[model samples]
Target: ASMPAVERQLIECLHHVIKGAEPQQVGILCPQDDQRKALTEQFGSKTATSFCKEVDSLKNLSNLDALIVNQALDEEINDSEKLDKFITAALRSLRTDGVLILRQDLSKVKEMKKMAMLTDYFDVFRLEEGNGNVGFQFYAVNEVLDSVYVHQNWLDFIWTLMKKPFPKGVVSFRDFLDRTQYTDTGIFAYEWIFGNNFISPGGWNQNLAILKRFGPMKTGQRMLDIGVGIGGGARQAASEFGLQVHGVDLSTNMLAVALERVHKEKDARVTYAVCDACEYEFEPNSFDYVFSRDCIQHIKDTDKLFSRIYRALKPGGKVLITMYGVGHGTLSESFKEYVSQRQYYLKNLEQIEEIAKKTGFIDIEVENMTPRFKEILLEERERIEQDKETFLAKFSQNAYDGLVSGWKSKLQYIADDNHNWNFFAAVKPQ
Candidate 1:
């Protein structure tokens, strides 16, 4: 029986998953011919097929990019053994990275209960339509895990699948900095907001943690700080860890302040330059450690950056970075607009990790540290409020309000699962 609304909802759900790609093979298991015709027609010119009588036939089909078990197959789910047969068939039928979409009525809470075992076999996430139809997306893997968790954030998951293409136009990092206020005055205001000599969040706290995690550095070892704003982390590395530090940035205003601070402190071991790290050529096998914080998102050529980094690092040397990353789920219009306005070139953690791997780096770790970012933002917001009079006397009320509101808005982005504050670390093999 083909209900027009359910058929349409199924099409909509299929569209969302396939939004990320047009699969080479998509197979549907539905009892009714008309419903199969409706579903298969949607995937025009691609290899789309329908199966009604033979569940066993699915076991014979190999490497299907996707498998859809429509509502008509609900009775098989109701029977435990029958459900096992279907799932087992799907396991072998789909490619290791393939997807399984199960469409069912949301009103049937009991059927949903039977489907609870889904987590045992697949990484499950839900998809819902405006007309109240629901779909469960299961990402097939090579083997079932000892522990599996379902993603409750449907909006974010969907957003990851349905990411819109970037808008036209390009903005360079230096030009963007000039357009946005990374000037001398703007740098000072940011220093006051973040901490003296630091423009990024978590200040001394995150710097120490990053170093300690990458640590036990040998004294007098050379380190390079890419996008090293104001030289806070570099100075600390040189002074505290006995590492020779050279920092680089694209903004002259930021480097001017950094140079001034280095001179003021009379730190001979630390040096800096105003240059694009992505395009800058450094001596081969130079640095023992390359560190960056909250900077990489501004550069569009991550592959080129990592390749250059690979050439520059000493054998067995490591690189660690923290950057603004995109979330795994859907992007809201506001978030998309925010990224466009800021001219940020963002990638999710997995995409970043893949780039590092492709660049021949090993011992890699990529972490989603958005919660820590959220905590830092909250603390900075409070600090700005507490130092209001001093901040206001030095900067404008617009500055004060803008800083607070920006932090507040980012908190919403975090809540919506649209922004990621990410950490990446990897080593060049000896």
Candidate 2:
């Protein structure tokens, strides 16, 4: 039978979790009172159900074979005292080998899973993300693993269990860009691409060439570098191009490194801050120019963001942009998968220009730099491979391999005509 996957999974999980347990003792704890009523009424005396508001009360109802958690105690996660008590009462009171099936967003919180890492509470576990939520199942060991915590995944991510730092496989497709693995592994990859001073593609010299196109930058002129990753572009604009730069980015990790470098006091004209470019407030006409690199694809609401950019820039202010764009050719399924899995919002150059025009931008000049970018990537990939030994000194081999794979994927995809790079020069009407 071609049953729905969700139906198949939930039923399969229930069958496995039950295995001769008394239905009266098996309880599902849902946070919504109405949900609790529905759950109770669905089986009517065949199953136990309760609301999370009375979670502590379940402590007195001990020696259960299974307890399914369908909600997060977000507040209790921070209060160790309360968390300890709850675990002691609700979980510790369970019989040995009992099952703890965590549903809802339980697996989304790292701290919650870390709390259950020890065998002193539960043993081996498996976790999976389904629909919009995640679920976890752990067998009671009533002992500790005596191993340090490492990264984990739906198999419930135990380091001692695997004796490795790398997660068994992909955790989430969408998190590929900003997840800890990429952040940690990518530090090396990015530095290698744009030099350690800058984390994005093209180093100081390459970016200097780009900035020179909008040349003869004025001294004391204000510029906003939106999505400024690590402030390298800002530093280049200020130090070499004679523009004071305010760097905006949502990544504290990037900002942290940027601030560390900025504090080195190489240049006073550049400043970095962590703020979402979409919601970040900017005084009208505060910036002489609004500069952005390949960072625009991460944002979904380009319409509103570009409108904000128009408002922030001074009349006749400069806008020099370089970003990835979907090519004019038909998008293959591979391209669709790439965009969806990486969580990117790919806009074509024409669409971007339309937004610019609608937002009061004029005299926009579009340059198709796709070929140049493809060349740069091919060279960078070779550089990464050639410089492997030096890179290995800093990061693990797996990290290096992963970095190269990402670089090569971008290169191959670009070469395959699925995507391209575009550079735009525009201005707010004087």
Candidate 3:
């Protein structure tokens, strides 16, 4: 089933690549027999001179106008030198301005995928089906265009690859948050509803709860707070618990507010950075604990996220995350629309537990805290009514009304048992 889909996309890509002119020579470096048969059948009917030569090695190939490597051929080349040799040989075989279409499977390095876009060896054209789940990359020989050096040293190329940011779909998600959800107005309204310097529900109370899960902390322990909006929780972690908090978030607006607040508060223990938590490479064993609040639902690939967190945490380090979850009752189209509109990726308690276990976490404790959050929302709405004058003093009538209605909808959602608030506490294995 997967191969058929892959073949279809590959054929389409090939058609587009060779639309203007027929290639004189093409080489394929695929090992699977059936895949080879399909590719041979496809290209044999199209190209003029010779369809393609099946290649196990590129050691002696030359003057190929196009090359296709499909379905885990590069899986065997696991080191820098071997990879260098293979890539350099592929480039060497291609004619000037020729194309190299690589059908890489999902189980490969994002580093090399980024490496292929270096602009030093090839003109990176497009990445087909370029999600974290599946994809391929397109590159054309750039030697004739002076965009590449045919004899460039491998070490320098590796160095260049190391310097580039690893590619992931989270960039688009970050852009989406910046444009729609975390804009200046959106941030202001949410902060007002959640409380000053905070953007999640229950504000300071939930923040303290997240910390209390760790019990008493030693002075000056390091904490990495993922999705740290306006640095409210980070400041508290530092000021109250003597944590050296390094806060990371995706929204520029949120980080901007955080910087301003930190500047005003003069909190030396807290710092903030804008990063995609799913892709950003945190130094291994760098922090004593990892903390997140109402954030993980936005990430599509929590497997990668939790793995990265596990690696970044020190031996016996803990991770505490509170996030939105899928409820047992889910019979509403409008709630589905809400999730789709906001681009959230919700999971249940079992899925969360399995993810943690698969990522080598221990002492995994997860809970459904939906009732507690419902109480918080009810209290929040009541306070909005009780302190209407104070709320209006800072925000407009529209914001007040928006907050009230939003809270009303959330309460309705809870009443129907279609929304869940979940908590997870786990420790990295020593």
Candidate 4:
């Protein structure tokens, strides 16, 4: 009933939920015979077999730690009867506080509605909507197999966005940046829904909100933002906080957009330059503060990049950066392959902090912000897919689908490791 990918994903999710527990005692419920055998082989002989047969058999089942319900109520032989029996069986079979994870296609809207009604029966219920392919949805669940995961796929997501077609003329990276306006409504809505669109209006709002929380931007205070896509964060700093902002980027296309946006503001002074943070030359302690939002991962050289950012700040100046950190040390082979193919530079949170210390930054703050992002991406997938026609028309089918597919893995990867966003703020001593 389930493909190898789907089964692997299910097992991965189960592994995540029961990391410290013994695998022998873990039980899995599958509708197919081959899956049951395969799972038994992978998990061990302690696996129990109860597929909606006798609901009470699972009652107070402590040894049975997790239940994976792959088959939806609609997919069963008898819609009402099978669903009722399965739900009843699951409720009784699961131990107190046991996890119930289910995966169903969004196309099965009615079934999903029915499934939602039964949420109260279980202690925890999590739903992950499928991308264009059902397999992608399964992969999303598999990401949860490990307790921590990385968000390195945004690089691929951005590239995919770049390759997409435009409304009338050829879709260039500059055009994409130009069309991305920075309005509160636009930014907040996009960030609230799609966390993967790092350059959207929503991301701007969220980044600004975080920055404001850290400290007020004073007049004449020098600040630098690397990979300043669309100039949303830079504008927010200059206009909202009254800081003089210098934005740097390797992308001429993104720099052009940043320049256009900065030009429009009369009161706030801002500048945009094309310079790679990995190798850009700048005077030591040139700026009061250095800022980067979801951009550090693109730099292939982490040691140099961290050192450069550290040196860019003046004495007592702060460096605020948001990066993708490794959530779980262990990940599915497929997921590893997917990340490696995209050329992502991912490091663990500890490693990043160590690098910061080595680079002479003090008072380092590294916090994990993956949960909120995972939830946002899961919710946004539905909204974006619903507006598929607009996306498809704006970008071609190939480009649109590729973007969706890329994000599907990205979101799932983050969810799997519970490692989504790492916020690092370090200050140099005066």
Candidate 5:
């Protein structure tokens, strides 16, 4: 039987990564029996291993230098508890500085990412992000035999899934985000793009700094932040600006993760819920202010959502919004196609102002921030590239290449004046 390309690529990366190590010294916990059987022939276990037909019958065993868990956890881990048990064993059976590697379908990149966060693994990377499926590999330590381990180790337990008959399952966008987007390391890449908290572009503090220049948001005021991406602004406003913030988003996963970050601050009066901002029921003349950052472009009907924002706020209430807008100039076909694919409903400043006026807004202030947004876009890439080896070591060459090119494409669109950043401050009529 031919070896799986995904499995082959994983071993190839290992061969270079943990070079000159004898295969006999490695331990593998394949959740799949056949995969365990196939790898057994090639890797030649030392302490000896087997398929899910059994468990730690051996009360006594030597610590192995490396372990590979190649079972596609897509279906296996719907159980949730299954991953905890597998991780507990893998980390326990390996020597200090040993390798803890898990290989999964490229589609499971995000799932694998969230799984990686379950342990304190070092030198994580996706080996084969080339075609059909991707493989992720994570290391245990920096030195050849570092005794450091992350999280808790199972005192006396070793188990893997039995090769059971089952139907196939489909991975969803929520699955992808949970696995990749919200995963600790997986989200690092995006945080590199939009930044986190007070650091980098689109950060809560940075955006709030811009807001303060327009006017002061008095402490104790209730603020509604629509489309709170990861709750950065919510947490910042609650803790730093002393605002009681209620954040709403369409993604349950985004809010779950956002709450995790916000709840950490005892002083932060922040809360979130999953809701479509456009139709969310809000009491008229309620909040003192409304805020959103870099997320309005995803709103299919901006007027409807803004009208909701208008009614949701107190009379004379203020709003601060920053969104990607269309600049005044000839647009390129390529840029239009890109934005179209992203399902972006970008509006020019003039059009947005009109909407504000038509929706009963007064004293509207808006700015064309295309040039500055472009500079920040380029700056973010440069900052990350400086950590080249660190990123390449933790993530794969392919992941690195993709982000580099992604930023490049973004810059091109902005430079052509097709996409621009628009800042807004408006007041509901008193």
Candidate 6:
């Protein structure tokens, strides 16, 4: 027994398929008054489902073939004690082999564990991750983690671990590219890849070599790069390929750094504006290509954003995008917490394709690039771990430790079926 709306509908559907009987004696346990009233009113007297303010009333429900719990359990119930109470109550209400479907935020690892321990009473444990809000707020997990050491460390650790580095002591502000270095290095790297500035060493040649084997860019093309952190891709397009490049992003601080780099390297004709990717001001047929890297999944309204991108591009415009995707199976509680605590909007390939199709993109191609990514992250982690003293001189002990801890969590996430990295391309029909 859970919240009445979707849970009730889902339960009814399950019962119909399994028992071959329309669910007549349904019981909905919801704490909210409005939900209880809505369910009672909708299901009227015939085969009326019982509605209760607490799970206690759900006892003696022997006819219940399944009890689906859809309350905002993770947030409403915190700590192990309350979780045990909910599970204990669920067990009492269920019959032999009677299913108990519990839906709760996977981020609360501690609570999730407590709930999972009751698997003896539950036949199946399904976990789902969702973006809790609309608009950019859904991506707030990244920003929130960026602000906290937990997130920063995770990214740092993944990079280092992929490179075969050991765990380090701490990390500091200095370890990162500071606003200027990050912008310049990132922008210059993109320009170098596009053949604009041959001087920059870290141009995405390493990455582009791999992407080119996948597809090549034509001349006179127009492209839009969302979350164009440091404007690397834009710089590459404008400077190296001589293509018009426009970028959209939410972080003005990061944009300021990108703007400075663009100004310094006058050859590339690039422009950037601070705006939400979900809703932007670009006109239809404004560009020939849409590109984003390690971004877009953070967007809450994937359909709206993809539709906007599709609408902005001319017919036959190509979209080259990369972001996190689901791995192989359900994620561990720790990994889910790592993501939810950070507030990231992670999606699996099925969800990604569904949203893409809904937004009108066709000829979609998706590839799992996690194996190489795993190597890169581990290598980077190893480098830092091996030279903790040298790195500490550049960063800090706390920052170093944070990076290690963060990587461990992220690696765990990558290993889970619920998380992975994927690159995809699609075309708008001509």
> Number of the top candidate by TM-score?
3
Question: Could you tell me which 10 consecutive residues in candidate 4 have the lowest summed lDDT?
Answer: 154-163
Off by over 4 Å in 2: 1-182
Find the 10 residues in a row with the least total lDDT in model 3: 155-164
Two-way lDDT contest, 2 vs 3, winner: 3
Evaluate candidate 6 by giving its C-alpha RMSD to the native, one decimal.
17.9
For each candidate, give its TM-score against the true structure. Answer: 0.60, 0.59, 0.61, 0.52, 0.58, 0.52
Clashes of each: 4, 5, 0, 16, 6, 38
How close to the true structure is residue 113 of candidate 1, measured as C-alpha lDDT? Answer: 22
lDDT string for model 2 (1-430, tens) is 1113322232234444454444555555656655445444434366554334555766665656555543445555556676555555554434444555443322345443233323222222222223321222222111111110121112121111111112224442223434542363465457766686676566777787788777567889999998788777898788876888888765544554565565445465666544567865567888888888888888889999889998998898888888878887777787788788667788888898899898889998888888888777777778877877787776677767767777767776776777888888888897
Quick one: best lDDT, which candidate? 1
Candidate 2 local Cα displacement, residue 242, angstroms: 2.5
Give the Cα lDDT of each candidate.
0.68, 0.60, 0.68, 0.54, 0.59, 0.53
Per-residue lDDT of model 1, residues 351-405, tens digit only: 9989999999999998898998888898888877787778777778876777777
- Give lDDT tens digits, candidate 4, residues 1-430: 2345446655555554455554434445545667555655655546554343223344444434556554443344235466555555554444534555564432224332222223222212122222311010011111111111121110100000000111213332222322443233344333334343256323655776668745666888898988776577877788777888777765544444454444334333566544456755566878988988877765668889888877778889988888766676457665678656544567778888888999988888888877766765666677777877666444456555655786787776775783357788889988
Off by over 4 Å in 3: 1-171
What's the best-to-worst order under TM-score? 3, 1, 2, 5, 4, 6
Residue 254 in candidate 4, Cα distance off native in Å? 1.6
Q: Where in model 5 is the C-alpha error above 4 Å?
A: 1-186, 197-205
TM-score, candidate number 6 = 0.52
Residue 115's lDDT in candidate 6:
24
